[model samples]
Every structure is written in structure tokens, then in C-alpha cells.
Target: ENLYFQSNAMTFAHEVVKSNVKNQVLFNGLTTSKLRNLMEQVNRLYTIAFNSNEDQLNEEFIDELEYLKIKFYYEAGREKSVDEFLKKTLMFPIIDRVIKKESKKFFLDYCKYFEALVAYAKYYQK
Candidate 1:
């Protein structure tokens, strides 16, 4: 049971990092490797949080928890649907131009998958 919980959280973070590589939604000033590593740490955090009972909170654990909370780069990516993403004016033009018009379907598909990863990340955080 514990292993499953941690495994799920780990995957959630990993997916976020993967999406961030293409979407660039999260970190503004951080390097890719560093950002990726930060997300990776959530695996163990799930374990620590699960193990620590309400009556047994430690100062160090609390500090660590706070650190993770801050490190969670909330998604900058937002959309109700693929159509909404396509209609986005600011970031869409850049995504469209770099990949070219021929690749529009690729963007449309991947953006939804990215949104799923982000949605799972938000669920894991809770």
C-alpha cells in the first residue's frame, strides 16, 4: 500500500517534469536538470508524509514539508480543452511558429496529455 502511494506520486512528479520540458509552464529561471530533480524528490515526500502521524510531528519533518510545498511549481499551463489551447494568443503563436503549421495536430494532442499530467500532479499534492 505504501509503495503504491509513493510510486504514484513519483510518476506524477516525473510527468510534470516531462511536460515542463516542452510546455515550459512552471519554472521561469531554473535549469531543466535542477527543476527535474526538484520534482523527483516528491516520491520520498509522499512516504514521509504518510508515515508521520498527527501526534508525532517533528520539527525537521515540518521544515521538510514546508520546503516541498514551496518547490511545487504550480502549473502556468491552463486550458479547458484543446480548442482553448489552440485559441490562446500569447503562447500559441510561439508554439505554432516553432513547430510550424504542419505540426498543429501534434501540438493539439500533446497539450491534452500535458494537461493530464499536470492534473495528476495537482491531485498528488493533495
Candidate 2:
């Protein structure tokens, strides 16, 4: 079970992250306040996604929160590094496995969150 990062999951992970990169056009035309609100929503979603209701966290479960904090930042500057990292590391091991048991909407929204984070970074960089 711990070895969630295996064969097919690897392929699927790449696909999702790749598709999101190509398709998602986040924050292209939104109010600064709205963008911030969405950013906050993403944060809250992670809190719940990783939340143990009261105390526990997910960076422990899906690597707690390291997937975003560490993964995203490190991969940010590199062109395709984020896609590779998000797929190979996060989706292959953590997200694909954990998100499988959740609802379809949950998975979709999570993908959106990834897109938002990327967009958020891109927007701020300007």
C-alpha cells in the first residue's frame, strides 16, 4: 500500500498534470480580490484535504503539505519541472492514491487548485 507510486499511476499522474498545464487558464481576468479569495480557498481546501478534522494533517497522509510548499516552489522556475514533479511525485504517490477514494468532484477541484497555485505564482511574478 505504501508503494502507491507504481506503473499505471505514473502514467495517469503525468496526464492529469500535463492536461492542467495546457488547459487551465487561471486568473487571466479576475479581480485582485477575487484572485486572493480563490487563493485563500485553495489554502482552505488543502487544510480540509489534509485535515484530520481537529488535529492531524495530511503532509503526513499525502505527505502532509510538502507536495505544494516544497514541490511547487522548487519546480516553479523550471519550465516543465512542475509537471514532472506533480506527476511523478505527487500524483504517482500521494494524490492519485488518496484522491481515488474521494469523489470525482474532489479530484477535479484538486486539479483546479494545482492550476490556481501555478497561476497564482505566475501572476505574482509579474
Candidate 3:
């Protein structure tokens, strides 16, 4: 009943796009280029995890996955705009697949969600 965005990536992306459009006056910190870069980061992990089995996903691999959150938080800390942007649009929404769940499907799903976000962000750009 909760984490609506966690369950529906497309809807999440749409919501984020609209939010960004409304907030562009001041919270214009996360550029599309930077967003693409972040997706690239997720894509790398997606490729690795895609090829590997559940058992093949060891602690190190999970650690590497968790590192993305760390990276996001670090970037979020850079400014109020980026902080709120990521918090509302990405960081919180992705936590479940990125960390809480430990499964091949969940891991792969995160990439799909992020990809949707990037595509919507590009389309909604003004």
C-alpha cells in the first residue's frame, strides 16, 4: 500500500518530472547530463548482475550495489537543490531494490526503474 514509486517506475518518473518542472525556478541542480551519468553508473552494475546468478552475488557485489546510495548521499550533500532533487526523485524511491531486497530480479528491476526515470526526464525537459 506504500512506496508507490517503488512499485511503479513509470509513474514515479512522471511524478518526478512534474516535480522538477515545478521546482526548476530554484532547484535546478540535477542536470540531465548528470542524471545520465548516474544512470550509466547503474547500468554498469546492471550488466554485471544480469549475467550472474543469485548465488554468484556475493557480499562484495552487494557492497558495490550499496555504494550507489553512498554516492547519491554524497552528491545530495553538495547543495540544497541537489539534496531535495535526489531525495524526492531518486534516492528514497530506489532504496528497496538497491539494498533491502537481495534477489536477481530486484537488482535488475532497479536498472529498469532508473532507465524509465532518465527517459521521462529527457522527454519532459523544458
Candidate 4:
């Protein structure tokens, strides 16, 4: 039923932030610079997709997503919460959407959603 796409990314992001805050073990590893790096990568792809009017992403971009996912997994530490945050909040939705369709709106929403996560993280994080 395309459950993930139907979800409001802003509210989803806020929920993620609030839950992570309760854990108190997640955000420390998800540093702002790291979050920025991941978010900018998505933005860069979105820009490319938007400007070119590409209906479907090439294999290269999918490959890039795979690589990013690996790096995200590698970024995790013994705590595991940071890994959960990255996989659940960010990468999964991204990978899911791009594979389903090349809707430019999805990318833009994701970017804004990521921004919300970063802002909320800052607000709730120590």
C-alpha cells in the first residue's frame, strides 16, 4: 500500500527525534557534520534528478545509495541506537522511494524532513 510514502515526513521526523531523545544514546554519534554530509548527498541527488527531469534514476545513483547505506552502517558504534536512527529515519525511506518512483517531490520532502530531524535533534540533544 506504499505505507512509507503516505507518511508525513515532517511528523515522522519529529517522532524520530523525540524518541531518540528519550533513548539518550542515539544522537551523540549522529553528529551535525555527519548528518549534514548525509543530507547533502540526498540533496545533491535530488538536484540532479530535478534539473534533468529524469523519470527514473540510473543504476549509478542506486549504487551510490547502497554505498551510503554501507557507510551509514559502518558509522555505528557499540550503542546501536545511532545505527537504528540512521537506517530507520533516513536511509530506508530514501532507498524505498527512489526505487519506487522518481517523483521529485519525494526528494524535496525528504530534504525538508532531514532538515527537521537535524533541527529537532539540536533542540533535544545535549
Residue-level lDDT tens digits of model 4 in 20-114: 66445445445565556566766676677667565555677667667766655665543354666776676666767755664556656666777
Lowest lDDT sum, 10 consecutive residues, model 4, at: 22-31
Which residue segments of model 3 deviate by more than 4 Å? 1-7, 23-29
Ranking by TM-score: 3, 4, 1, 2
Of 1 and 4, the candidate ahead on lDDT is 4
Residue 40 in model 2: shift from native, Å? 24
RMSD of each: 17.6, 12.9, 3.5, 4.2
lDDT of 3 by residue, 1-126 (tens): 665324476777777766677644424644566555567778888888888866346677778877777777766776565677676775566664557666778767667777776677667654
Candidate 1 Cα lDDT to native: 0.39
Local accuracy by lDDT, each model: 0.39, 0.44, 0.67, 0.65
The weakest ten consecutive residues by lDDT in model 3 span: 23-32
Runs of candidate 4 with Cα error greater than 4 angstroms are 1-7, 23-30, 77-81, 87-90
Better of 1 and 2 by TM-score: 1
Candidate 2, residue 78: Cα displacement in angstroms equals: 10
Error of 4 at 117 (Å): 1.7
Model 2 TM-score relative to the real fold = 0.27
Reference-based lDDT, residue 15, model 3: 74
On TM-score, the candidate that comes out on top is 3
Candidate maximizing lDDT: 3
TM-score quality measure for candidate 4: 0.67
